[PDB]
Amino acid sequence: CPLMVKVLDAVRGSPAINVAVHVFRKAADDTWEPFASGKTSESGELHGLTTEEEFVEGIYKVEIDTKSYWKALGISPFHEHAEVVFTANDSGPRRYTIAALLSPYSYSTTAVVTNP
Amino acid sequence: CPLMVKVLDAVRGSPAINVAVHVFRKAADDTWEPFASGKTSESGELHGLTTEEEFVEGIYKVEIDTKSYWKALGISPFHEHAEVVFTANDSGPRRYTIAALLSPYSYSTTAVVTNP
Amino acid sequence: CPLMVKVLDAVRGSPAINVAVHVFRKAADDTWEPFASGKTSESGELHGLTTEEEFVEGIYKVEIDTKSYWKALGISPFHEHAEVVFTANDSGPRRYTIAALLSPYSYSTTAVVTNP
Amino acid sequence: CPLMVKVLDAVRGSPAINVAVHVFRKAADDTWEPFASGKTSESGELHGLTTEEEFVEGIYKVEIDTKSYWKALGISPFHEHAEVVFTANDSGPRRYTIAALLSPYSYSTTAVVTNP
Ligand SMILES: COc1cc(C(=O)c2ccc(C)cc2C)cc([N+](=O)O)c1O
Ligand SMILES: COc1cc(C(=O)c2ccc(C)cc2C)cc([N+](=O)O)c1O
């Protein structure tokens, strides 16, 4: 609910289906602690990662396993993964969508942050 | 149903709301004929542009009125509009989403084409 | 010199070489008048389109022939071209670089505008 | 020379000047070892990070300090940095250009890889 990830494929013109996504939260010692993870659905979307209670302010990293995605399609990739690192700030009610558009040698990412 | 447009704002991190979108189909004389149009909703989406019966194969242009969008936000823009020109090809059942991510001096667009 | 175009290939991670580019300028009767054209070099760059004298104020359209590029690589892409439409030199001469990043179902474009 | 970084600003339509960039290389114990760092110039480019001798095969992370860039412009952005993680030189030396296009809530990155 508070955090959704959506992944699209710029080569095939499709959702990026069955992509592994890991979310980490930065710990006090500056290490990355696993927070949530899953695989994108047939729509390219990954829902249900966290809850309002669990998602507190902090620094988060979303790692999208793009290399494995491209390899499963038989397409030669450049990156190991796509990484999105951001701060969650409580500024009234907010829902976050982290969206990524994947190509073999490029990616784009945006945040769509809305007030429900 | 067969054609949806979605527009996002990379500066504000939001859907691009109330953006005018025009769709044209290329005529035999190479001119662009108005085909459908509307304004994006609060989700950034524009549904209901056309019907399965009306949307035939051909060359289409989607013009997204980005300059007016940025001006309404008080942000100085570069482009007059964003233009997406593509061929619709009947290759089994297909639904098209034309998505765009807007910045003042840049835009990105992709097509998400799925079989319902 | 005042107008340069650069095109990159997001599948191969390379310059997009031998891409045709056509520049138009909106005429007083609202038609698109041919202005300049050329092909990208081995670096993906297209220099020498115009001159300071010829590049007057106006609304310009840069059409990048992405479909012909993909077809030459044996790929059937989604878009016919990538189009960049902008007002130029409205506050005196500027140098414009129009850059594009290509995938079969997506493109991104940015402008870099500098004052000499 | 073998590794160059270029950063552009999609709000202003300009090179992103004075952007800090830190490159790491994955060590045999799976930690990220510092490798090279620098700042983009007035053209948005960062040359001279490394040498052919030092740039061995490995997994590299290029961290572009986008938050510090935006904060210096008086903007509160979404991301902490932009991260580009890739295996380099796996089939012999290549020249890599890592390019990034920045907005407050989005970034795009591409790689241009050439064989000398
Ligand atoms: C089809 O549906 C969607 C598509 C897209 C995108 O195509 C998109 C994704 C990332 C980037 C950096 C840029 C683009 C244009 C995002 C969406 N979303 O809701 O953010 C979305 O729903
Ligand atoms: C003006 O000069 C350059 C521009 C650009 C880009 O505009 C570009 C950058 C990132 C992305 C994701 C997409 C785009 C189109 C890249 C360059 N390069 O060498 O990669 C370059 O030289």
Residue numbers in the entry:
A (entry chain A), B (entry chain A), C (entry chain B), D (entry chain B): 10 to 125
From the manuscript:
Transthyretin (TTR) is a 55 kDa amyloidogenic homotetramer involved in the transport of thyroxine (T4) in the blood and cerebrospinal fluid. The generation of amyloid fibrils is the result of the rate-limiting dissociation of the TTR tetramer, followed by the misfolding of TTR monomers and subsequent aggregation. The native tetrameric structure of TTR is a dimer of homodimers related by a 222 symmetry.
The crystal structure of the TTR/2 complex, determined at 1.10 Å resolution, confirms, similar to 1, the “forward binding mode”. The 2-fold axis running through the binding pocket generates two symmetrical binding modes of the ligand, which are rotated by 180 degrees in relation to one another. The Fo–Fc electron density map at 3 σ level clearly defines both the 3-methoxy-4-hydroxy-5-nitrophenyl ring and the innermost apolar 2,4-dimethyl-phenyl ring, and the two binding cavities are equally occupied (0.50/0.50). The 2,4-dimethyl-phenyl ring of 2 is positioned deeply in the inner hydrophobic binding sites HBP3, sitting between Leu110 and the γ-methyl group of Thr119′ side chain on one side and Leu110′ and the γ-methyl group of Thr119 side chain on the other side, with the 4-methyl group of the 2,4-dimethyl groups pointing towards Ser117/Ser117′ and the 2-methyl group of the 2,4-dimethyl groups pointing towards Ala108′-Ala109′. The central carbonyl group of 2 is pointing towards the γ-methyl group of Thr119′ and the β-methyl group of Ala108′ in the HBP2′. The 3-methoxy-4-hydroxy-5-nitrophenyl ring remains in HBP1 and is held in place by hydrophilic interactions with Lys15/Lys15′. The positive charges of Lys15/Lys15′ are counterbalanced by carboxylic groups of Glu54/Glu54′ at 2.87 Å. Overall, the pose of 2 is distinguished from the pose of 1 in respect to the orientation and position of the dimethyl-benzene ring, which, for the former, binds somewhat deeper into the HBP3/HBP3′ pockets and mimics the pose of tolcapone and 3-OMT. In this study, the X-ray structure of TTR bound to 2 reveals distances of 4.5 Å between chain A/A′ and 5.0 Å between chain B/B′.
